[PDB]
Amino acid sequence: SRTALRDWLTEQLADLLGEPLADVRALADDDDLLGCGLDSIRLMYLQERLRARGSTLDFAQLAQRPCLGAWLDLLACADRLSAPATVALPTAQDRDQPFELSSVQQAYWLGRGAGEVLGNVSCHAFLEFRTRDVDPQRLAAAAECVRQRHPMLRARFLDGRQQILPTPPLSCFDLQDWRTLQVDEAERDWQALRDWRAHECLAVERGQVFLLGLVRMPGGEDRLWLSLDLLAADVESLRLLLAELGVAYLAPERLAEPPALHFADYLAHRAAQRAEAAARARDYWLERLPRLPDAPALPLACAPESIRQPRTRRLAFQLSAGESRRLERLAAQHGVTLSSVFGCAFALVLARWSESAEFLLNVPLFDRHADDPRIGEVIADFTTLLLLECRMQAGVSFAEAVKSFQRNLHGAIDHAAFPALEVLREARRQGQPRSAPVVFASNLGEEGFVPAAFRDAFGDLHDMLSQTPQVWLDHQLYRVGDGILLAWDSVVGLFPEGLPETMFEAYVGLLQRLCDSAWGQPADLPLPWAQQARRALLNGQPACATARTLHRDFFLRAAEAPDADALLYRDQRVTRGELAERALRIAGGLREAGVRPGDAVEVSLPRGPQQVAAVFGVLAAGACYVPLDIDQPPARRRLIEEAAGVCLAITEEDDPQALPPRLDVQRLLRGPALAAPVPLAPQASAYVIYTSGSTGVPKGVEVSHAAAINTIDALLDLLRVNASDRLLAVSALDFDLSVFDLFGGLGAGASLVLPAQEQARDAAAWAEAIQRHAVSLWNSAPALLEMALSLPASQADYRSLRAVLLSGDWVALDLPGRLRPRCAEGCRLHVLGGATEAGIWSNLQSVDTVPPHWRSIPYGRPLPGQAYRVVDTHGRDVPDLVVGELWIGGASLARGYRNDPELSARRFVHDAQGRWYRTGDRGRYWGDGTLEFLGRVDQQVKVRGQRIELGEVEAALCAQAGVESACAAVLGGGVASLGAVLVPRLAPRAEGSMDLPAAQPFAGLAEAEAVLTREILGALLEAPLELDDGLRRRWLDWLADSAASALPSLDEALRRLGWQAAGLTAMGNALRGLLAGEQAPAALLLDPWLAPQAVAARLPDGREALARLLEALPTPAAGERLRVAVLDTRAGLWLDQGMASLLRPGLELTLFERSRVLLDAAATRLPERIVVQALDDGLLPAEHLGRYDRVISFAALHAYEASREGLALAAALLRPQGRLLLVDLLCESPLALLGAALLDDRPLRLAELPSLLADLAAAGLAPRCLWRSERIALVEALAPGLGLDAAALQAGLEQRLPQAMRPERLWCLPSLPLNGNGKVDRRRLAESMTRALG
């Protein structure tokens, strides 16, 4: 009855809150009980009382609607609709026996071992307290009294089990009386004792789970301190050890009763009583296990595997009684537990310090749930560990975040019934390596953490430590005073030195603005202000530029000294006057050709003075130059000419009827000179560099003169570039480092040494050109300079080279090591950062030397006038050392992409901090404000210094007629090659019209294989212990079901199948060799008596199928070449049964496999004139696509994960109108079924013939089923015009990609592998291609 139930709940709440019964009855039905000071510890008690009343509700059901009315309306359902909690408990377990560990004690125990991830430590709490005088004889009594009073305080831990001893062999109390000492010595010795015993691994293996102790300081001070391994205790149990030590010190007679409910009795009861909720929670965790977030991805100075004996460092902050009150009142007004305030505020900090906002944290629940009320006096480890996934919402108030985090935590509390350790174990077994190495422990009992009976004897908690193993950062909370001690037991040296302090200072700041300001304020933290202060300096670097047309300065340097050498090229030179005139003639020719201000002009000239004159001439016509290599291939050039909206192209070719009108630079050099460059305002489009672009369409990066010249000035004024300098422009014109050579170098009036197009990658030409023109300035991607430095110092003298710019790709840490002894005195290497989209660069790390902690040469300070943010995936700045997305900002940015406003809005984003490029580079601001770049998260990679989007390479391969989809990756090995992988499209058909005469087989052959199974198993089942239990259970039954029952025959079977007693003897012995040699399972495929294809090739009349599959190969009678391939080679063992008439005169035959080792076992025995080709790590080298007039599959199509795998592979491998020849098991071969059992791989793979045909016709091949039917069916099928070939791909790549990004090696898969998100597995494919490089 509902009113009687509200009375019962009122009485439970009046107990659990301690409020009066009448006052609690006066709470309204919708009045929030967390809004009255209910918390989770009380609510699990109330929920346990409801469970004990048979009124079964989950904690989450009560907790998602935490008010009396909602509880009553849940309960009016549950008292008739919900399951009874009735379980037959074990009423006792034998009290001295080595009983099982609780799940969280198993975690601590396994974490105690030296080998485990961040292991080798206790899990102990250490507590320190102060007082003037206390008696050691009271304390030595008190410690041994509490060891005898509570079973768990003397529990030995061995071998994954715990044993309550009679009395432990080792003392409970460490008296350290030092009233003898000098204070300074005792205080340092205290620090030595503190450091030892607060990190000490307690001797739990000898039942010392806890050790009290007391230093007596010569300053007249007793530092009572307490080491307790939480293997023995909940921190709630620890504060009861404190209460009892308090009474046992003060008045030991008042210790009421040794609390009777022994911990083995509790674990037996609790495990059985949780068991259905644990199985229900297990279903929930299994459905989430591939979807768990990881560890909080915090900035680690060391890998957690690599610090061998982790000291905890405590950080702590006593929130005042007033701060606590303000959190408690706001928490109540916002309907949340005080633990959810702290857990949410901590998860916001962890989110803000993580590379991802989704992570686990290990939340130790209280789990004191047993029927005897004295369980709340027992001292065992009643913790149970909740693996809280939390998934912190960015861009919300804290009120929204804490309610979300509470509903998440409260929702997860029932799912803690399956313990966090078994979740993580099941993750490790499922190949999900995950851990929850950040702990969160709310210990908020209002009596105080240190209980009254102990505070009356000793000072309130002076200090403490955790030592939780596997755990980086143990965040406890305690009531201390009636305030709240926040503690972060971070691990020493795991994090960067400033970080846990800085992160905790931001956590305290967060909790204080939660005391002191309403929760409608953002959950998204400020940075720790000092981090934002540093970064606002480094971003705030002043413009350091005069906003002007980009060409202005060169035309000034020309007007100021017309005779000075502007360009040096192929051992001739061009003056600034000559170049300015040549440019202004081009400009006049361009205005004559209808080009006009901020309209755009392609420049596509071989590297040399006419190119430089043309870009200056475009700019001096007022136009935006759109550089492309002359090597840029015609279809790609048409994508760019189309996308750029380009007015004109300059190309040495005259063609006024091209896509843009295309012009001879030599004719534009006949043009009248403009008397000046056209006046452009600084913001006009200056260069549009066509970077590679991920949809396949290349992308024009439209950079204003202001933007370009802000980078250039910021760097000219740093290099101190002057008229005596000369630059080697190894920069290609469509790679925007050239824009600095071009308008920086000549704007300062330094000369440009240009390589010829003949010298575009030629280190020896650069070395000659540098030593010949005494080049002072280098500028490149470091791939080009490492190439230049690979010439010896005797062959390539760079001592003229005053200063060096390295850019746009990873500088190796030893490149300044190679470079400083090679280049000039005053070497001035600068490594520069930032993308095409940001003007020519955006950072500068100078490198006089590399300090050893650089893992890469960082992006330095931002260049003057431009800036970096590093952001979370929600746009807010990440804290220092945290990885986030590099946003380049400020005056240097490109205006956008030339005609892609939507991709521009995706990249050039606007924020309260101005305009930002959102690069997709990852990186982190170090504590010194330097910006370590950390590579890229996305499909964009660097090939020979140049930028490539793998999405472009893939799209340029999908642009092949015949490709369904593609993958690309830059590969491992010293070659650093770009690879790619193809799925062909199959041109499907439906082809059920089939005309196989089925009649050749007879049932006596399946009976004969049954008799041979009776021979082989009848012998090996004299020694069935050679097998495993799966082989035994199958083969003992199959000795009827596949060998004799309903399959009678004589040993004439063997004479019908064709193998005789020497064969059977080798089958039995080779199988014993497979079993007992430890080579399982793969050695099945290395022996002609073992393998499913080798047995099939004679036993099921696979030889009479082979007599037809060995035919359709006309080459010797044709007098002419036939190209043939085999998919199902394995160790070659079926070809060995056709070999002489298989290996026909005139033939090309190629072996393929899907492993190396089996094909190499084929090459070890088959004649080496046959061509050998791995499909290494699944992967077909594309040099074989469309090559073969005949393709073979043989007694292994079942072994492909679909027929559609092998059939698409065959269809790709076949030349058009060439033929597949396919034989496979459809019916059981009883002996191939032994082999299937030894692979332990399903004989359900053996197709029906209609299904084989439907899959094959879906793979587009037109079939005829020929012969040999249900034992082994020979199908041929004939290839459509799939249109792929090696040379056709190479030609289509040569049409659509420059030689920078055509894959130097190319492959195919019948489908791409998916990672666990359902996206293409570019890491597995990068590895697979790397393995396929050999």
Ligand SMILES: Nc1ncnc2c1ncn2[C@@H]1O[C@H](COP(=O)(O)O)[C@@H](O)[C@H]1O
């Ligand atoms: N010093 C560098 N080290 C490594 N990568 C760099 C460096 N400088 C620039 N990059 C990055 O390389 C990426 C590819 O080059 P980009 O074509 O300009 O986009 C960009 O996102 C750049 O920020």
Ligand SMILES: [Mg+2]
């Ligand atoms: Mg770029």
